[PDB]
Amino acid sequence: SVQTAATSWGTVPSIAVYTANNGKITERCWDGKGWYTGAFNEPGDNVSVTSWLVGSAIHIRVYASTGTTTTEWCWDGNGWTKGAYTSSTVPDQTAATSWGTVPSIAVYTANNGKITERCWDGKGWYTGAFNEPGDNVSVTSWLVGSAIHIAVYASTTTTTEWCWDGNGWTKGAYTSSPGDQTAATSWGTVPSIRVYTANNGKITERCWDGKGWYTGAFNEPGDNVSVTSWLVGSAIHIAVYASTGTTTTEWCWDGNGWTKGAYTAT
Numbered sequence: 001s002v003q004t005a006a007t008s009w010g011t012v013p014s015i016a017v018y019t020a021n022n023g024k025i026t027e028r029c030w031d032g033k034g035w036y037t038g039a040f041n042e043p044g045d046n047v048s049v050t051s052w053l054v055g056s057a058i059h060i061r062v063y064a065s066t067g068t069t070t071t072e073w074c075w076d077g078n079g080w081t082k083g084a085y086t087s088s089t090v091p092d093q094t095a096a097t098s099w100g101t102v103p104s105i106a107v108y109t110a111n112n113g114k115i116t117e118r119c120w121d122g123k124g125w126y127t128g129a130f131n132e133p134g135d136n137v138s139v140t141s142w143l144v145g146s147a148i149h150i151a152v153y154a155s156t157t158t159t160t161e162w163c164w165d166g167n168g169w170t171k172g173a174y175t176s177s178p179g180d181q182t183a184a185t186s187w188g189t190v191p192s193i194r195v196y197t198a199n200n201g202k203i204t205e206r207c208w209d210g211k212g213w214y215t216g217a218f219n220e221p222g223d224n225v226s227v228t229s230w231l232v233g234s235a236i237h238i239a240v241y242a243s244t245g246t247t248t249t250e251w252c253w254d255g256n257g258w259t260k261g262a263y264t265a266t
């Protein structure tokens, strides 16, 4: 099927969805009044994205996988340009997260059954300590004040949660113990986490609200899943993108059940 990645920002919100199809990545954007086609058009078979607000200006980084490299593509208000990211890979699935306004970035790559990590601290790219088995990776992160926490979901036999608390990596209380493709989001400082798994054409949901994992009401057909969420005061909003072949369907949580969203690819 096509493979998607989703970021959002502000409270309207704005959404960017990236779809990899026949080696091309294209962008559908939402401004609060209709979906439209963004400038982004780069080569790639797989995509992940992350973004951050500097005051009220969005900065977007798309990690596009092209055989023996992943290229970073940068939006900073005035067009797409190539980023300082470099890797060396084999015919590659990535997950990205970022935090603060510096910002800091962590990119996880599953290459031939191993997940590895590249980190950006504002000075340059370096190799992170993370290195664990997996064919499939998703990531979410949250600030507790100025301390970053990172939850990596590595799917190989079992999906394993790997938690970073700022001084070491450990196995988390998640494990839903073939060919799982996961997408993760989180919100607040508890935090809440939702992990979506495409397995055998069903997408299903696992939930953390600080007091143990449980199966969520989310249940929709798809072979690929991406997700983004945003808070408005105390209210969470989620957009899940479920894909089968070239058909991507949006599912929205606005606090009153999962409903089909307006998203089209066109």
Ligand SMILES: CCN(CC)c1ccc2c(c1)Oc1cc(N(CC)CC)ccc1C2c1ccccc1C(=O)OCCOCCn1cc(CO[C@@H]2O[C@@H](C)[C@@H](O)[C@@H](O)[C@@H]2O)nn1
Residues within 6 Å of the ligand: 061, 072, 074, 082, 083, 084, 085, 086, 102, 103, 120, 123, 124
């Ligand atoms: C574009 C081509 N690439 C990528 C392959 C590249 C370019 C330069 C270097 C490169 C690689 O590697 C090294 C390595 C060394 N070392 C140890 C590190 C051994 C001697 C030394 C020099 C180079 C240098 C280097 C040599 C001499 C002088 C300066 C540098 C340098 O600027 O370095 C790169 C970062 O410096 C400032 C340039 N830069 C890049 C950005 C990017 O900011 C954007 O936004 C960020 C948030 C990220 O998304 C980021 O990826 C994105 O591009 N901001 N500033």
Ligand SMILES: CCN(CC)c1ccc2c(c1)Oc1cc(N(CC)CC)ccc1C2c1ccccc1C(=O)OCCOCCn1cc(CO[C@@H]2O[C@@H](C)[C@@H](O)[C@@H](O)[C@@H]2O)nn1
Residues within 6 Å of the ligand: 194, 205, 207, 209, 211, 212, 213, 214, 215, 216, 217, 218, 236, 253
């Ligand atoms: C207080 C002692 N008792 C017996 C009286 C008890 C104990 C645990 C639960 C209990 C009750 O109830 C639930 C109920 C659910 N529901 C509601 C029917 C969702 C399927 C889930 C887990 C337990 C859980 C639960 C089970 C296992 C692990 C943790 C919890 C838990 O955090 O328990 C307390 C927190 O539970 C969350 C309550 N709830 C409902 C929703 C809204 O929906 C969820 O969140 C949305 C944002 C979406 O992701 C949606 O798909 C997803 O299902 N969010 N939270």
